[PDB]
Amino acid sequence: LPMPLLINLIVSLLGFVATVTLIPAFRGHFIAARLCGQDLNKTSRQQIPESQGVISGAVFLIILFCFIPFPFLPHHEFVALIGALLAICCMIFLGFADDVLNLRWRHKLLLPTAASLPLLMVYFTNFGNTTIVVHLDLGILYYVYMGLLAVFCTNAINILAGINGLEAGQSLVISASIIVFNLVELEGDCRDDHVFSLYFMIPFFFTTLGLLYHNWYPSRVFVGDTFCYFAGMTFAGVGILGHFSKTMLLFFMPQVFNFLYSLPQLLHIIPCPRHRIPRLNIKTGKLEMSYSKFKTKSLSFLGTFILKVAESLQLVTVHQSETEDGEFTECNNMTLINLLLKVLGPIHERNLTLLLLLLQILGSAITFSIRYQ
Amino acid sequence: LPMPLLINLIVSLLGFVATVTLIPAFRGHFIAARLCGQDLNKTSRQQIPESQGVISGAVFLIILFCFIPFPFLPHHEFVALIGALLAICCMIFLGFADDVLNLRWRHKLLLPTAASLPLLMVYFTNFGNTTIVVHLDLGILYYVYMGLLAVFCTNAINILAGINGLEAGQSLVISASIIVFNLVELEGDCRDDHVFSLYFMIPFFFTTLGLLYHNWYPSRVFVGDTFCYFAGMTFAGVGILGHFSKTMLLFFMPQVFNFLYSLPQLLHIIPCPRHRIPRLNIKTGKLEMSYSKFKTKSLSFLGTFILKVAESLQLVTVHQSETEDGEFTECNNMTLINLLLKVLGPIHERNLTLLLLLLQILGSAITFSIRYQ
Ligand SMILES: CC(=O)N[C@H]1[C@@H](OP(=O)(O)OP(=O)(O)OC[C@H]2O[C@@H](n3ccc(=O)[nH]c3=O)[C@H](O)[C@@H]2O)O[C@H](CO)[C@@H](O)[C@@H]1O
Ligand SMILES: CC(=O)N[C@H]1[C@@H](OP(=O)(O)OP(=O)(O)OC[C@H]2O[C@@H](n3ccc(=O)[nH]c3=O)[C@H](O)[C@@H]2O)O[C@H](CO)[C@@H](O)[C@@H]1O
Ligand SMILES: [Mg+2]
Ligand SMILES: [Mg+2]
């Protein structure tokens, strides 16, 4: 039973060591390729290599390619293995192309949909359960759900970002929670689904651990959208093929809140700045809330209602002003990072990430409490 | 029998139209990403977008992802379908990473080996014939051959390059020749191997046709190593899984000659310039042979022997000189493009590519003559 899992653990540890070693080896290449960026929440104007998710993602693929023959050494699970790797690999690829080319916002939705196609087709060919428990047969709409799941998880991680070790950290907690959940369900019942998930979650964990080694505060490298795209698809892939997307989405609680809280800014009903990461008080050294200021006359009818409702619900900190240019509204940037800075006041970057990571652990523990009483 | 082939042809035509439309749409993004280069054989110093093989390659993948359920709508060929796409997709990815990052020469060998792993494992799991006809069982060495085949075809195309429409053009002739060969063998005998090859060769053809639309003289876009990597793996994949790598390698005759003729320069026994593309006589407008000048005292014992042998065989045009700096040897750059310019004299770029393409057609016709008497 654990014979291939042993081999998977062995190659995943080698993959950790590979990721830790290779990340600083390709440093030059990324900086030369202009694949870098400043640490926007630090005074240092130096450029730190970006898109390092491509190196962990690459290690992850090569690990699993070598692993492929072991579970076989029957095709119903083997199809799902090569199928899920196709989807993950295509996603690391289109994700990296997006990092290199900076495609229009439409592709943040089209690329995950594109890459998710092998998962859908494997589910189609291996005769997948289109019926859902609330007892409803969604049919074609179930495949729309599977497509959208990949789109969701990638962007949900990507919009809960911008502080040292958060993106890679939250994924690290999520994969660990999936691993723990798989091991519990490996004791009986649906087992071939959970031994399957472990085959991707063990290598995803140790490679991301190798990435976080160089990403954790102070960040020596940045993960890029390549990592957020990669993570999202790996999670959506194991959720779908393991048939536990419901349970997996509950492990996405901080990501789901942060998304809906961001919805008025994403939909531009309230002006949305390109970067909604907190400000650094250079005197304090700690992070402070970021704000989006705008002319109140330019704001839409629906936008004034949402902002008034969210302020009264003790969620958004709004600040009215009136200069020579006119009357302005300096409202709080709608994200979970800022809401923690609203409630708990200014927080140092290292503790802020670690706080959201703890909040992530809390949610996983709540899900495990829901599911096992 | 042709029901899925009809669907494959339909999506491949849509893929052509997609490639022609999208190539000029992402132009901005590539130039902005510094993914471009000058037309080194033209006076214009403007920068033309590079790595457009990524857009044809991307279209190729999405085409085939949509095609996946059709041959099914049994897993022995379905595994080989998802397996070959994994290898091709990983290769387009690592090929593009190489275009973006400019990795050391070692990776021009490591990336194709890395990406070829799913093919090997599919061949392993689906119980592939390790025995070869000269009757010898190569076993592990057969897998070494499969790995090296991908390495060969990618670089063999990549070193027979540097003139408008050559890289994409030679692949276009090769895929057409594989298509013709498949259709002949579709009449009987081994058929499931040739209907399989057609599934990748039809979409490879029409996407490359869309690429060559913007690449053909005068090049409006450049294909990049991404295309050479992509092409090589798609050809190695169909050759391996179709069991016709021998026949396929004979379609690689101009690529095999150009490789062995380049061997003294590649091995640096004779100095090798980074670009061995012909020179443009600005007065003539036509292309002229390129040369590699070096001090004869610095040349190795083996290098003097090779150069003397190759000169007497009427292959290399050597020119001795002696300035104030010392005695120099200005020998001809060892490539098939230059050998055609040695034998046929200066040739215009458009006719030179078209001449090598004709030479490619000639070789395919020779192979078809070998094989069918
Ligand atoms: C709609 C939405 O919510 N978009 C967010 C998303 O955009 P988005 O994903 O587009 O932004 P990027 O992936 O380009 O951001 C990466 C850049 O952010 C900065 N950075 C990133 C990580 C880190 O620990 N420290 C750091 O300073 C660096 O300049 C880095 O180069 O993520 C950004 C931070 O990643 C947030 O500003 C954006 O508001
Ligand atoms: C060992 C070997 O044989 N290496 C060759 C290989 O290197 P290599 O593959 O490394 O070179 P590249 O792929 O970077 O060359 C692409 C560049 O070549 C020029 N270019 C390319 C295509 C074209 O039609 N016109 C044009 O001018 C452009 O500057 C383009 O940007 O291919 C080059 C041309 O592709 C040749 O010079 C090199 O000698
Ligand atoms: Mg991002
Ligand atoms: Mg090249």
Numbering used by the authors:
A (entry chain A), B (entry chain A): 7 to 79, 91 to 151, 162 to 400
From the paper:
It catalyzes the transfer of an N-acetyl-D-glucosamine-1-phosphoryl unit (GlcNAc-1-P) from UDP-N-acetyl glucosamine (UDP-GlcNAc) onto dolichyl phosphate (Dol-P) (Heifetz and Elbein, 1977, Lehrman, 1991). The DPAGT1 structure (as reported here and by Yoo et al., 2018) consists of 10 transmembrane helices (TMH1 to 10), with both termini in the ER lumen. The active site is on the cytoplasmic face of the membrane, formed by the 4 cytoplasmic loops between the TMHs.
Complexes with UDP-GlcNAc and tunicamycin gave data to 3.1 Å and 3.4 Å resolution, respectively. The C-terminal end of TMH9b and the following loop region (Phe286-Ile304) display the largest conformational change with an induced fit around the GlcNAc-PP. The uridyl moiety of UDP-GlcNAc lies in a narrow cleft at the back of the active site formed by CL5 and CL7. The uracil ring is sandwiched between Gly189 and Phe249 with additional recognition conferred by hydrogen bonds between the Leu46 backbone amide, the Asn191 sidechain to the uracil carbonyls and an extensive hydrogen bond network involving two waters links the uracil ring to five residues. The pyrophosphate bridge is stabilized by interactions with Arg301 and by the catalytic Mg2+. When bound to DPAGT1, UDP-GlcNAc adopts a bent-back conformation, with the donor sugar lying below the phosphates, rotated towards the uridine.
